[PDB]
Design a protein around this ligand. Structure first.
Ligand SMILES: CCCCCCCC/C=C\CCCCCCCC(=O)O[C@@H](COC(=O)CCCCCCCCCCCCCCC)COP(=O)([O-])OCC[N+](C)(C)C
Ligand SMILES: CCCCCCCC/C=C\CCCCCCCC(=O)O[C@@H](COC(=O)CCCCCCCCCCCCCCC)COP(=O)([O-])OCC[N+](C)(C)C
Ligand SMILES: NC(=O)OC[C@H](O)[C@@H](O)[C@H](N)C(=O)N[C@H](C(=O)O)[C@H]1O[C@@H](n2cc(CO)c(=O)[nH]c2=O)[C@H](O)[C@@H]1O
Ligand SMILES: NC(=O)OC[C@H](O)[C@@H](O)[C@H](N)C(=O)N[C@H](C(=O)O)[C@H]1O[C@@H](n2cc(CO)c(=O)[nH]c2=O)[C@H](O)[C@@H]1O
Lengths: 660, 660
């Protein structure tokens, strides 16, 4: 049909394994694609699934993305998938998953560039019988090729994963898998790969559900099946399973403090936040590593906004229309909820889990968090600045009201997180000075030293994040984290010391109240973990996270706000606009935080002004500090309480549904 | 000789003008150079000057550098040169400059790249008969050409410069000029352009004196001749004239405040600093726009250090060995003074002047000053960190001692300038608070507002200089300068107000002393200007400079320290080292200044610590502020006094030499 195709018989050894035979098992198809993803249909590109005498009906289509992963991570992910399909076909009382479930299940593996792909994994892929060199063409009839499509259905299954080798076997218990290997001619953006999946192949495949995976992610032994079960309600359009750190063999990785704190964080985010948000019906972010979308729900407006942005735009740049790309993923969720005349919702099913690797060194950790913080902030402001769209959807009145209250709660979250830095120093200074004034022994020298340490660390972090890169200077970041850990240790010691002394004296008072409130939040965390029935997470070095806490409050935030856009003709004007908007958020951040600090501690000449106005007719401490300190933990207790109540509701309805 | 040469007869019209005739007048030589500058000799490249039957003896060789200048600036510079040579030949009583003195002089014009050269000026050059297209070759016998050499001796002289057109004429009063047009095949560093002059052509030309000019610089009607006269002393090896800001026709540019302040600065630097430094015998910097070097003195070690750097170096990077390039020009001066077994000195002759254009908009002004500030700081630290070399030279003991004391004085200059920012804010705060405490009327609100304004401006400048570029954001810099001008206005008003009130009361006291000292420095400036016999410069909007002063103290310095290296395999390691060293000077700067501010104003918890130590047994102001404020103007008066004394000595010896 004017296009280049090539069929090469499957490896004779692989054919012998298959024997251990209809045409699709014995051969590999190769197609060369030279168009952008949205011409696969009418430019006469096809797949085997439609070439049979009776076209195959796709019930699930699976996508995984590779950039440079070695064969271990990919092997693990496909081990999970093949196990899950084996359980799928093993089901008896399921028409969707009977003797030939894989007939309705095809797995697509989206590479990114031959140059950066790890041939170390191409070895395994060739072992599976879906990849052979020799017939790769970079340009066809003066048309540059866009992607290579390799297409085979194997019989070999992965069965064990050792730290070094990948165990594959072919027996009578194996289950056929339909493969779709796509190799982008050159390395491209992950969103482009998603477009190749959604805007492209999915259109021909006509799938009922599309699940986004990620190389190195472990589906549970039945997590995919459970996720599919969640879609029996005709209202859900997206869903996501709990994601936990893969830790290490015999939990060895749990030695690393960073891994320990990250583990506790992953657990919390999946115990309070997601259950609370899924109670209302809107989830802030579906993890890109593991998510599922009903295809018909997402087509149209969502993919438009995701791949193109707000088309309605003049020649000049606008804030949203040229900044929404930093919330690339989150916007999808928003767009499905408030679609016109459609009542789609999102759901969080806790019993489908996935274990993933995490960054292990400070540079990679920071370079990862940066994207997440920027995306979260931009998506939150975009959602709150356009919430009225929810009233233009097809929801009933109750859903609409619940979505409204949820939006207000989320904006309260983003605002309280915006002024976190000011509270951090404001609290530390108040407690340190309070105790030093109280007892006089040796906190006096300590107070001065700690203040200087915090100032130098805060400044140096600003300078380094604005000018330098994390890769060049790794030692200083580790030292900064250590210093913040020491400061947090001293803060806790002061708190407990004052609490004990005040208890003896009653045998100040607001600090007895603060220890009440801190005990309250810790006990509520414990109860929340107890309800979920995974209470060893609190024992997973949660204290290690507490020590690293200050770092996240005074290091991740500064870097995230100091590297907003990652800058490097129309291009120069765009770069100038990006640089201008980057250096304008930071100044606002510092000024707004310092306004609170000045109002409370009475620095910046305010004390001098007050004292000398009274002369017209300075103190060491005022009641303002006491009031502020009471208020901050008032708020912390409130947040913990509302989140605990939400978690209980989610678990209660989940259990009640199980009872029914 | 295995090389490509090409002779084309001079324009017939130009030939007719010449008639209005020996061979060198009637033809243009063209040579193609394909080696690096230090093979012009032994790779058999020659020039006409040596091709005559009796080789011509070069008494002066002149170099001018072009990057993109239009025909006006170049035309002005060559107008100056031809006038000066006309006066040179017009001289009667001289053993050297006779009727054929022009033959002993050759002018070399070093371009930089065909791509960026202004063909708008190539028009004028072709008019002069030293440039014709058609026979340009970019590569000769698989060897890339390095430079095009065009060679002619004209008879036309420039006679008037209108804002639009260049008046050229050919009459009986014109004087022949020997030209050497060297258009670099590709644009490159100006130092590389100089490398072609000194390490290259000069070796064949064997000149007695080489004068560095710059496109757009006006030699005086006799400045070149005077500069040559300065070399009759067999000890001088370099000398420089005096640069005057171009006020423009009827001082039209003067209206611009920036031009006015720059004019006053150019005058001062040439009235106190250079005369004082030339009294001892070492000049900090010979202006690249206008300078003169005795060739034999500079050959050897100086060009080695200038073009290559400290060869003695390991694989790793060292501070000096890889940072000296930022003081590219200044080092030359140092190297001539402390040459081994040579007693060369530098001299400053005031009566040779040169008028040049200056940057007129804030972005270009800042992008210019940056290089000067970085070069000055690095050269000063390099000189003071290696001063013992002076004792290894061939000077007598008296010269050696004078050079020692001068080096100490220069390091005192660089140190006092290093802690200028801290003094700026420290003084402003002390005066504003002092007055506000004094009188209570409305300085109270003003004091608080001014403090906040300074803080925001200082912060915003830090952020913008670290992250952004001056080109993108021009408006904010102008606003910053305006704000600093307003702050300086208020500072002056407070000073005079307190002085007047204290005078009435005596009809605090340290501030009566400060007004004494400020009157002292202003009157010493006036007397210094009076002695030099150019006292209209004080009337050239010197007050406009005073208003812009704060800006230079709190804007030029921050940008200079925040863009030290201009960063953008061995290259990546080098870039990492540059980025590391860049972000380490800044932190030192801030910490050292804030240490002074904390010690004096007693901020940073020091007051809290003192008060609560006394509790173990805070004020609004202490005597420390009074002591510091007295000391700072003590120092300012000292500097003004020593500089005035030096200026007088220079003028006295100059006059005495004239008397003798
Ligand atoms: C550390 C500071 C020293 C080392 C310098 C370090 C360099 C910076 C010095 C700035 C000037 C501080 C002077 C000063 O007195 O600070 C005071 C406020 O506390 C601070 O100002 C804390 C500043 C912490 C961050 C330091 C800068 C980092 C960059 C980002 C900057 C973001 C904004 C930072 C400010 C919120 C110190 O405390 P105090 O006021 O004496 O407490 C008693 C108050 N009372 C008398 C009313 C009861
Ligand atoms: C402007 C500040 C407000 C707006 C914030 C602006 C943002 C920065 C706030 C930092 C915290 C300041 C808090 C404070 O009380 O400052 C005090 C010191 O004066 C300063 O600290 C002046 C700081 C000027 C530069 C501001 C930062 C620019 C970046 C580079 C930073 C480089 C280092 C900057 C510091 C030398 C204010 O004065 P005071 O102490 O109340 O005076 C009486 C003292 N007494 C009671 C002992 C008699
Ligand atoms: N909560 C949660 O997300 O889990 C953690 C999450 O799994 C991470 O830990 C996980 N290691 C991870 O980074 N996955 C990436 C992602 O999808 O974001 C995958 O995208 C692919 N990719 C990415 C880029 C740069 O964006 C590219 O240029 N090309 C490209 O191909 C690549 O295959 C990468 O693996
Ligand atoms: N006190 C004092 O110096 O006077 C002020 C001084 O004259 C300035 O105002 C004067 N406008 C000026 O900038 N002259 C430059 C200089 O010599 O530094 C000349 O160097 C040339 N050049 C420069 C670069 C970049 O460095 C290049 O890449 N290529 C290149 O050819 C260029 O011809 C430029 O004109």
């Amino acid at each position: 049909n004017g296009n280049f195709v090539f069929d090469s018989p499957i490896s004779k050894t692989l054919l012998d394994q298959y024997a251990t035979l209809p045409n699709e098992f014995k051969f590999m198809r190769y197609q060369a694609v030279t168009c952008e993803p949205n011409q696969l249909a009418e430019k006469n590109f096809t797949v085997r699934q439609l070439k049979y005498l009776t076209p195959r009906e796709t019930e699930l289509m699976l996508v995984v993305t590779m950039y440079n992963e070695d064969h271990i991570l990919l092997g693990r992910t496909l081990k999970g998938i093949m196990d899950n399909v084996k359980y799928m076909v093993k089901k008896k009382n399921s028409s969707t998953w009977g003797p030939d479930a894989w007939k309705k299940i095809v797995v697509c593996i989206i590479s990114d560039g031959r140059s950066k792909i790890n041939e170390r994994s191409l070895a395994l892929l060739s072992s599976l019988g879906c990849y052979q060199d020799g017939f790769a063409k970079d340009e066809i009839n003066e048309k540059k090729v866009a992607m290579h499509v390799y297409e085979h259905t194997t019989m070999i299954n992965i069965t064990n994963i050792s730290e070094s080798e990948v165990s594959l076997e072919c027996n009578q218990g194996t289950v056929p898998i339909q493969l779709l290997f796509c190799l982008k001619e050159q390395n491209q953006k992950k969103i482009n790969s998603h477009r190749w999946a959604f805007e492209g192949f999915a259109e021909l495949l006509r799938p009922n559900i599309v699940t986004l995976l990620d190389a190195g992610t472990m589906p549970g032994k039945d997590s995919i099946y459970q996720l599919w079960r969640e879609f029996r309600n005709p209202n859900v359009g997206g869903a996501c399973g709990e994601i936990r750190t893969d830790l290490g063999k015999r939990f060895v990785k749990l030695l690393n403090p960073l891994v320990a704190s990250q583990n506790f964080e992953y657990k919390m985010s999946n115990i309070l936040d997601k259950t609370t948000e899924s109670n209302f019906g809107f989830i802030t972010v579906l993890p890109g590593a593991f998510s599922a979308y009903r295809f018909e729900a997402v087509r149209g407006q969502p993919l438009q906004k995701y791949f193109y942005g707000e088309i309605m735009e003049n020649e000049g740049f606008h804030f949203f229309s040229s900044n929404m790309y930093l919330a690339e993923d989150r916007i999808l969720c928003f767009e499905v909820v408030t679609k016109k005349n459609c009542n789609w919702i999102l759901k969080y099913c806790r019993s489908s889990y996935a274990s993933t690797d995490v960054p292990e060194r400070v540079p990679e950790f920071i370079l990862q968090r940066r994207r997440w913080l920027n995306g979260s902030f931009f998506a939150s402001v975009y959602s709150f600045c356009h919430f009225y769209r929810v009233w233009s959807s097809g929801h009933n009145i109750g859903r609409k009201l619940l979505l409204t209250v949820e939006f207000f709660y989320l904006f309260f979250n983003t605002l309280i997180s915006w002024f976190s830095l000011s509270s951090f120093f404001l609290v530390f200074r108040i407690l340190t000075v309070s105790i030093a004034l109280a007892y006089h022994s040796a906190f006096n020298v300590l107070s001065v030293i700690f203040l200087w340490l915090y100032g130098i660390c805060t400044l140096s972090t600003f300078i380094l994040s604005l000018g330098n890169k994390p890769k060049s200077t790794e030692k200083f970041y580790v030292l900064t984290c250590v210093i913040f850990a020491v400061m947090m240790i001293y803060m806790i010691f002061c708190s407990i010391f004052m609490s004990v002394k005040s208890f003896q004296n009653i045998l100040t008072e607001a600090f007895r109240d603060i220890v009440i409130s801190l005990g309250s939040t810790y006990c509520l965390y414990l109860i929340s973990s107890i309800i979920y029935l995974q209470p060893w997470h609190m024992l997973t070095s949660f204290i290690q996270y507490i020590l690293l806490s200050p770092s996240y409050i005074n290091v991740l935030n500064i870097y995230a706000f100091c590297n907003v856009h990652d800058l490097s003709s129309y291009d120069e004007k765009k770069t100038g606009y990006y640089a201008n908007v980057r250096s304008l958020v930071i100044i606002f951040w510092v000024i707004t935080n310092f306004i609170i600090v000045a109002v409370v501690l009475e620095t910046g000449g305010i004390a001098d002004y007050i004292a000398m106005k009274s002369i017209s007719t300075i103190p060491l401490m005022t009641s303002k500090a006491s009031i502020y300190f009471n208020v901050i933990l008032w708020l912390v207790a409130l947040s913990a309480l509302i989140r605990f109540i939400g978690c209980s509701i989610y678990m209660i309805v989940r259990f009640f549904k199980k009872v029914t």
